[PDB]
Structure 1
Amino acid sequence: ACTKNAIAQTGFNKDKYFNGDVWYVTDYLNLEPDDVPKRYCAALAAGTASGKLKEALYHYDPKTQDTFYDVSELQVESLGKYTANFKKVDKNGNVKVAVTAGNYYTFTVMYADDSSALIHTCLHKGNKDLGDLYAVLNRNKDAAAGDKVKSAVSAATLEFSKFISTKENNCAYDNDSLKSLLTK
């Protein structure tokens, strides 16, 4: 179950965040800790494609090799707060699991600048959810979390020390697929 109404960044700059480029997850915190593995790789692209607000997601479990991509049309709830559908696709955008009622995530940008961000998501997939999930993002897949984003974690009344890093998993991404998936 999700429990947090995440507050979007004051003065969030949507066009900068949704610029078509890739964001890498460097650290994450699930409030239901057993909802997700302790080793994981994730990234997304975010942009407007032919007037439509889009995200493309990538998930990879570096131990099991479980891999999946998704394409998401985002609807606006308020500035920096979205409800995303999702269809599971291969890396080329071919549909594996169509959009359906009941499969959606919320997505809140709590903090962002040109290089870093803090987001919250609540996944609903069936009558189930994947509890509250916070993620620290960077444009540079190898970047240690800096002071702007760590301060934002504190301002959310969270402890960065509890976040799990993705950096020791040999994560390798297909940026080209993420960018192209925005159009799909």
Structure 2
Amino acid sequence: ACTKNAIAQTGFNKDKYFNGDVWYVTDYLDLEPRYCAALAAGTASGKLKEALYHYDPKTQDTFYDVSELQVESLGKYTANFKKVDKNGNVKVAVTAGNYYTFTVMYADDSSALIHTCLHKGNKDLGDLYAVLNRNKDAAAGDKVKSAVSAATLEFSKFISTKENNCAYDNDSLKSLLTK
């Protein structure tokens, strides 16, 4: 179960974050504990959208999702996901109870700290924090690391994805934003 009400960045710039480009997860902190993950965030016909990519570099399990984000407040969203193939073909339709919340705690032009809480069927899932970068496997800079500290989190507890043999289809993620 999730336990955190993450606070969104003061002065969060939604147009800059939801600009259609890709964000790579470089480090993550699962509160209820080795996938690679990335997302594109953008707008399509005035709707906030995210496309997600998960890849397990050991098992090869790979899945994509597309979501419309509903606004709770600035920087805090609720997203109903549909599982799709890389082309946007629907594999699992949207259903109530399958959603995640998404809070942007810090963002700038190259980096971000987010919180997400996943709800899926009758599964019991926990909070996840992620450090994001515009560049694949980029080392976390001082701004986002300071934001981790300011959120009262210990960055040394995060797990890096940078040393995983991961590959990302950024072209598919960007194209999925319209799906």
Q: What interval of TM-score do these two structures reach, taking the shorter chain for normalisation?
A: over 0.9
Kept after mapping to 1: 8 A contact 2:137/2:161: no
Kept after mapping to 1: 8 A contact 2:64/2:86: yes
Structure 2 equivalent of residue 17 of structure 1: 17
TM-score w.r.t. length of structure 2: 0.98
| Secondary structure of the corresponding residue to residue 43 of structure 1 | strand
TM-score w.r.t. length of structure 1: 0.95
Q: Note the C-alpha offset of 1:170.
A: 1.5
Q: 1:24-83: CA deviations, max 9, x gaps? A: 000000001xxxxxx221000000011111000000010000000000000000000000
State how far apart, in whole Å, the 2-side matches of 1:136 and 1:67 are.
21
| Secondary structure of the corresponding residue to residue 147 of structure 2 | helix
Kept after mapping to 2: 8 A contact 1:122/1:129: no
Structure 2 equivalent of residue 116 of structure 1: 111
Task: Say how many residue pairs are matched.
Answer: 178
- Unaligned stretches of 5+ residues in structure 2: none
Kept after mapping to 1: 8 A contact 2:25/2:38: yes
Aligned Cα RMSD in Å?
Answer: 0.6
Q: 1:107-128: CA deviations, max 9, x gaps? A: 0000000000000000000132
State how far apart, in whole Å, the 2-side matches of 1:23 and 1:63 are.
22
Q: Percent identity?
A: 99
Q: 1:127-151: CA deviations, max 9, x gaps? A: 3242000000000013100100000
| Secondary structure of the corresponding residue to residue 75 of structure 1 | strand
- Unaligned stretches of 5+ residues in structure 1: 33-38
